[PDB]
Design a protein around this ligand. Structure first.
Ligand code: CA8
Ligand code: CA8
Ligand code: FAD
Ligand code: FAD
Ligand code: CL
Ligand code: CL
Ligand code: CL
Ligand code: CL
Ligand code: CL
Ligand code: CL
Ligand code: CL
Ligand code: MG
Ligand code: MG
Ligand code: MG
Lengths: 437, 437
C-alpha cells in the first residue's frame, strides 16, 4: 500500500519505522509541519537544564538519514491542511514555498498530537515548550539576554520538569499556578513533597495566582503583586491538533480528539489515528480513556503496523494510564482511573507508608502507597505512590496486576524479591492486601 | 486453642503475632532454643559490616515486650527435644537448668528453620553466621584479635554479603568456593559481574578451591597453596533443624525437610510447619519447590494464622522463588524455576541488554534481562536480571506476571510508567515480548 503519515515524532515516525520492518516494498511518506522529525519530546526539559548537551540525544534522525536507513520519505515544513477522504488524498502546504498540493494514499495514519496552550499575552519574553524548535529558542533567549529570573506558569509534569531544570542550570525560577491543584494526575493530598522541595531550596511559588498584565519585563499579577522577570515559560495545558481534520468525514469528539477502535481505526476505512490525538478505553474498566503519553504512542504505532503489514489479529486491549514524574528528590506515580473518575464506582481506599527498604540499611525514605478498589468485585481501580525511593517499582507491579485483573486481596500473594536494600518480607504491596481484609 | 510454636523468629514469631491479631483469647507459647527472639536474620551481614550500628535494628523484640504488647509467652534458651504427637505434648529442655518438661498443645506450629553446616575442623578462628549470638561472637573476635585477613568460604548470597561487609569495614577478605557455581540462584553466565567487582577491588578469589587443613592460622588448600588468615567465616550451606522431629509421626523427606499441603499442614493432625523447614510446590508449574527465604516464612505465617483463627479457605498457591542480592554496585535477581530445573521443560530463551533508563539521562547503566518460556504454551518459566540499576523492578513485575501464568507474548502489553529517569516507552519487558516471535 501507499502509506501517508501525518506527524513525524512519537507515534508517526515510530509507526512508519515499524511498518518498514514488516513491509519493504510499500512507499511511505510522512508530512511534518515543523522543522524536526524524531525529536525526544521527553528529553526537552533536560536539554533546557543542560543535563542533555549532546544534540544526538535530542534528535534521533534527520529526514536525509531516515531515508538513507529506512527508505521512508519525510517532508518537514509540510503542513497537512485538509483530509480529502472521499478522494483518498490529503492536501498539503509546503511552508517553504507556500504552495499546496494533493498527496494520494492507500492507508493514512494520523499522529498529529497536541499543541501547547498559550495565555495569549503579547510578549517577547514568554515561551511554550513542545518541540525542539521551542527548546532552541528558549536556550537562545537565555543566553542572549543573560536570563536569571524566570517565571514558570502551570504545575503539571512539564512545568515541574522545566522548573527543576531551570534551577539546576543556575537560574532563579518562581512557580505560579491558577489554583492549588498541582500535578493533577496524582491524588491531590499526595503532592505536598512538591511544595516541600521548592521550600527546601528556597524556590518561591504562589498558588491561586495568575498573570494579570505584562509590560516588557514588568509582570503584574492577580494577587496585586508586581515583579520583574527576564523570561516566562507557560505550561498551561495542551489542545489537540485536529482543526485540519474537521472538514473531513472523520468523527471527532466534542473536545477535538479522534475515537478509535482496538485496531486504531477511525470511522473512515483505511484511516488510522494514534498517539495523543486518539481516544480509546481503559483495559480494566468499561470507561473511555485518553492517555496522551509515550507508551501509548509507541504501542499503538506497533499495533497499527501489524494491522497494515503484519498480523492483524493483534489488537489493543485498552489503557491503564500508568504515569510518572520526577521532581527533585521525589517520584510521583499513578496508574488506573483518574481521581475524578473514582466517583463512577462504589470504592474503598487502603494505604500504607513505609520505608522503601530496610530501615537499617542506609538511605531509607518513606514510601506512601495508596490503592483504590471496587467494592462490588474487589478489583483494583487506581494506585498511586510517592516517595524518594521505590515508587516506580510498586506502580509497575500494580500496573501488571491490573492487567491480569487482580483483586486487592490477591496482593497478599505477590511474591516480592526481598533483601534489605530492596523491600520487606511483607512488601508495601503485600500490606495493602492484608489491610484490605 | 492452646498454641505452641517452635522457633521464635521469621516464621514463628510472625505466626504467633498474626494469630494474636485474630484471636485475643487463646494462650500462645513460643519456645526458642537460643538467646534471642525476632532477630533480623537478614541484617546480620550488615551488622558485621558496621552499616548497622544500633542493635535495635538487629533485634525487634524481647520476650518481655512481646508479652506486654501481644500477651504471648516466649521462653528463650528452651529447646524442644521431642514431639509426643499422640498425646499432643512437646518435651522441652530448659537449657539453663538442664531440666526437661512437657508442654501441652491443641495446635503445634513448627518453624525451627535451618542451621549452618560446618566443615568440621577443630579451629578457634572459624565462624558460621545464622543468628545474633553468632554475629556478636564474630564482631567480638574481630576486635579482640585485630583481624585483617579473613577467609570467606562459600559463594552463596549470604556469604557474598558478608564479604562485601568485611571489605567495607576495612578488612581484607579472600573468597573461595568448592565449585564455580557462585550465587547459584542466578544464571551462571549472568554472575560474572560478581567476579568483575571483586577484580575491580583487588579482592582475591579462587573457585574450585577448598580447605585441606588448618594449623593455627596457617591454612592449607586443595590447590596446594598455604596462606595465613586471622579468621575464617564458613558459609557452606545449611541443614534443617529436624532431628528433634524424627521420633514423631511427622513425615520427613530424605533430606530432613517437612512436606506440607497448601494449608501448611503436616501429615499429623493439628501440627503445621512453615519457614525453611517446609517444602511445597511451585505456583506456575507442577514441580516441588523449596524456597528458604523470608517472604515465604512471612506468607506461611499469615496463612497458618488464618487456618487456625481466621478464614480457613485461605490457602497457599505455591512458590515462584523470587530472590535477589546486592553485591557492590550490582543487583542480581531471578524468579521462577531454578537453572537446573529448566531441563524438565521444552523451553526457549529471550534476552535484552539495554539502558535501565533513558540513554541521555545521567547515571545510566546496561541492564541485562533474560526470560525463559515453555514452548508448549508460551508461559514464562523463569526470569533473571542483572545490572547496577532497575533489575529489582523488572523481576518484581515478572513475578506478578507469572503469578498469573502470563505468556511471554503478552509482555508487549505491559504498560510501563515512563519518564526519562525510569525506563523507556518500550521497556525492556516489552522488548522481551516483541523479541519472542
Ligand atoms: C518522551 C516522549 C516520547 N517521544 C518519542 O518517542 C518521540 C521520538 N521517537 C521517535 O521518533 C521513534 O521512536 C524512533 C526514535 C524513530 C524509534 O523508532 P523504533 O521504535 O521503530 O526503533 P528503532 O527502529 O530505532 O529501532 C531500533 C531498535 O529497536 C528494536 N525494535 C524496534 N521494534 C522492534 C520490534 N517490533 N521487534 C523487535 N525489535 C524491535 C530494533 O531491533 C532495534 O535494535 P537494535 O537491536 O540494533 O538496537 C520520551 S523520548 O525521550 O522521546 C524516548 C524515545 C524513544 C526511546 C527513549 C526515549
Ligand atoms: C530477614 C529474614 C526474615 N526475618 C525476620 O522476619 C526476622 C524476625 N521477624 C519477626 O520476628 C516478625 O516478622 C516480627 C519482626 C516480630 C514482626 O511480626 P509481624 O509481621 O506480625 O508485624 P508487627 O506485629 O511487628 O506489625 C507491624 C506493622 O505491620 C502491620 N501489620 C502486620 N500484619 C498485618 C496484617 N496482617 N494486617 C494489617 N496490618 C498488619 C502492623 O499493624 C504494623 O503497623 P504500624 O503501627 O507500623 O502501622 C528479614 S529482616 O531483616 O529480619 C526483616 C524483618 C521484618 C521487616 C524487615 C526486615
Ligand atoms: C516537554 C514534554 C515532556 C514530556 N515528557 C513525557 C514523559 O516524561 N513521559 C511520557 O510518557 N510522555 C511525555 N511527554 C508526552 C509525549 O511526548 C507525547 O505523549 C508523545 O509525543 C505523543 O506522540 P504524538 O505522535 O501523538 O505527538 P508528537 O510526538 O507531539 O508528534 C506530533 C507531530 O505532528 C506534527 N503535526 C501536527 N499537525 C500536523 C499537520 N497538520 N501536518 C503535519 N504535521 C503535523 C507536529 O508538528 C508534531 O511534530 C512529554 C511531552 C512534552 C512536550
Ligand atoms: C545471614 C542471613 C541473611 C539472610 N538474608 C536473607 C535475605 O536477604 N532475603 C531473604 O529472603 N532471606 C534471607 N535470609 C533467610 C531468612 O532469614 C530465612 O528464610 C528465615 O529466617 C526463615 O525463617 P524460619 O522461621 O524458618 O527460620 P529462622 O528465622 O532461622 O528461625 C528458626 C528458629 O528456631 C529455633 N529453633 C530451631 N530448633 C528449635 C528447637 N528444637 N526448639 C526451640 N527453638 C528451635 C532456632 O534457634 C531459630 O531461632 C537470610 C538468612 C541469614 C541467616
Ligand atoms: Cl520556514
Ligand atoms: Cl509535489
Ligand atoms: Cl547550580
Ligand atoms: Cl483446637
Ligand atoms: Cl546456656
Ligand atoms: Cl515450667
Ligand atoms: Cl556501567
Ligand atoms: Mg547548550
Ligand atoms: Mg560496633
Ligand atoms: Mg514419642
Amino acid at each position: 500500500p501507499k502509506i501517508v503519515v501525518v506527524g513525524a515524532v512519537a507515534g508517526g515516525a515510530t509507526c512508519a519505522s515499524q511498518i518498514r520492518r514488516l513491509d519493504k516494498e510499500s512507499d511511505i511518506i510522512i508530512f511534518e509541519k515543523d522543522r524536526d522529525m524524531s525529536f525526544a519530546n521527553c528529553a526537552l526539559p533536560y536539554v533546557i537544564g543542560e543535563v542533555v548537551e549532546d544534540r544526538r540525544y535530542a534528535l534521533a534522525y534527520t529526514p536525509e538519514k531516515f531515508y538513507d536507513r529506512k527508505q521512508i520519505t519525510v517532508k518537514t515544513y509540510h503542513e497537512v491542511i485538509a483530509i480529502n477522504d472521499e478522494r483518498q488524498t490529503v492536501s498539503v502546504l509546503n511552508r517553504k514555498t507556500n504552495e499546496q498540493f494533493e498527496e494520494s494514499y492507500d492507508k493514512l495514519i494520523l499522529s498529529p498530537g497536541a499543541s501547547a496552550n498559550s495565555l495569549g499575552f503579547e510578549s517577547d519574553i514568554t515561551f511554550t515548550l513542545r518541540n525542539l524548535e521551542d527548546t532552541d529558542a528558549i536556550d537562545q533567549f537565555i543566553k542572549a539576554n543573560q536570563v536569571d529570573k524566570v517565571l514558570v506558569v502551570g504545575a503539571g509534569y512539564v512545568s515541574l520538569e522545566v522548573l527543576e531544570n531551570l534551577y539546576e542550570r543556575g537560574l532563579h525560577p518562581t512557580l505560579i499556578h491558577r489554583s492549588d491543584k498541582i500535578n493533577k494526575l496524582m491524588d491531590a493530598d499526595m503532592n505536598q513533597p512538591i511544595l516541600d522541595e521548592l521550600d527546601k531550596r528556597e524556590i518561591p511559588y504562589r498558588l491561586n495566582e495568575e498573570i494579570n498584565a505584562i509590560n516588557g519585563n514588568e509582570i503584574t499579577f492577580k494577587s496585586g503583586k508586581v515583579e520583574h522577570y527576564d523570561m516566562i515559560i507557560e505550561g498551561v495545558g495542551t489542545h489537540p491538533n485536529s482543526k485540519f481534520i474537521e472538514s473531513s468525514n472523520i468523527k471527532l469528539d466534542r473536545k477535538g480528539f479522534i475515537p478509535v477502535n482496538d485496531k486504531f481505526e477511525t470511522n473512515v476505512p483505511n484511516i488510522y489515528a494514534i498517539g495523543d490525538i486518539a481516544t480509546s478505553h481503559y483495559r480494566h474498566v468499561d470507561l473511555p480513556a485518553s492517555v496522551p503519553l509515550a507508551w501509548g504512542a509507541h504501542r499503538a504505532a506497533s499495533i497499527v503496523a501489524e494491522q497494515i503489514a503484519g498480523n492483524d489479529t493483534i489488537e489493543f486491549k485498552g489503557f491503564l494510564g500508568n504515569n510518572i514524574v520526577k521532581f527533585f528528590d521525589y517520584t510521583f506515580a499513578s496508574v488506573g482511573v483518574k481521581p475524578n473518575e473514582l466517583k463512577q464506582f462504589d470504592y474503598k481506599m487502603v494505604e500504607v507508608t513505609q520505608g522503601a527498604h530496610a530501615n537499617y540499611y542506609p538511605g531509607n525514605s518513606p514510601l506512601h502507597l495508596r490503592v483504590y478498589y471496587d467494592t462490588s468485585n474487589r478489583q483494583i481501580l487506581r494506585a498511586a505512590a510517592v516517595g524518594k525511593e521505590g515508587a516506580d517499582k510498586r506502580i509497575d507491579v500494580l500496573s501488571m496486576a491490573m492487567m491480569n485483573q487482580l483483586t486487592v486481596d490477591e496482593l497478599t500473594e505477590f511474591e516480592v524479591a526481598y533483601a534489605p536494600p530492596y523491600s520487606h518480607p511483607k512488601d508495601l504491596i503485600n500490606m495493602i492486601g492484608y489491610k484490605a481484609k
